[PDB]
Every structure is written in C-alpha cells, then in structure tokens.
C-alpha cells in the first residue's frame, strides 16, 4: 500500500522520490499530500456573460 | 502479510488506501478493522410468522 511520488528538487548536491504509507483507516488522519491543482481566475477576473477578447474594444 | 484497504474519503484536498500489519500471534491483540456488516431489522421490526405486505391490510 505504499505511495511513491516525486519531489520537485530545488537545490542539487534522475527523479528523487519519497514514500508514503497511510497508517490509519480514517482519511482525516492522513497528512496533506500537497499535490494540488491550479485553476484559471476567470470566474472572478472575467465573470462577464459575453467572452472578452482583449485586443478588441471591451464595449462595442 | 500486509493488508491494504481503502479509506472512505470524506473531505478532499483515485482510491486512498491504508496499510495494516498484525504484529502479534493472538487475534485479541489486533486493532478493530471497522469493516463491519449491516443487517435488516426484521427479526425485531417484523417478527411475525406471516410475511407482511405493507400496502395490504395488516389484518385480513
């Protein structure tokens, strides 16, 4: 049940990996993976009904 | 001898699993798996000799 993931190696001395085994039944007990996703800011930066083309006039 | 089971993941950050190894000869020393079964309440809620059909009269 071991999970093997790669580290993003910053300062250097192949891929360096690290290992993780969950010891508990409850997922709440797990550490944080930090394997997170990004999204586009559009729902906040461009919430307009008609798609914005930045080279065009915003008002036409 | 490792046992690998899945966690029911509640709050999220695939299947997340966890690992279990029993360290002792006596099953009494084992932790609780919590992998438990449910049953129908009928032996207490419907202990009648003739099967009950809920849309029908209980007395006929």
């Amino acid at each position: 049940g071991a999970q093997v993931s790669s580290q993003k190696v910053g300062a250097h001395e192949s891929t360096i990996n690290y290992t993780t085994i969950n010891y508990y039944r409850d997922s709440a007990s797990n550490a944080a993976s930090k394997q997170d996703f990004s999204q586009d800011p559009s729902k906040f930066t461009e919430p307009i009904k008609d798609v914005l083309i930045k080279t065009a006039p915003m008002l036409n | 001898g490792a046992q690998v089971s899945s966690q029911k993941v509640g709050a999220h950050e695939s299947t997340i699993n966890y690992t279990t190894i029993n360290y002792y000869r006596d099953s009494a020393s084992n932790a609780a798996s919590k992998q438990d079964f449910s049953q129908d309440p009928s032996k207490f809620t419907e202990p009648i000799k003739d099967v009950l059909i809920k849309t029908a009269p209980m007395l006929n």
């Binding site: 049940g1 071991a2 999970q3 093997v4 993931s5 790669s6 394997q35 | 690998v4 695939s14």
Partner: peptide, 5 residues
C-alpha cells in the same frame, strides 16, 4: 503494493 505518482 505500490502506487506511483
């Protein structure tokens, strides 16, 4: 066994 990411 082992998962790999």
């Amino acid at each position: 066994g082992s998962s790999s990411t």
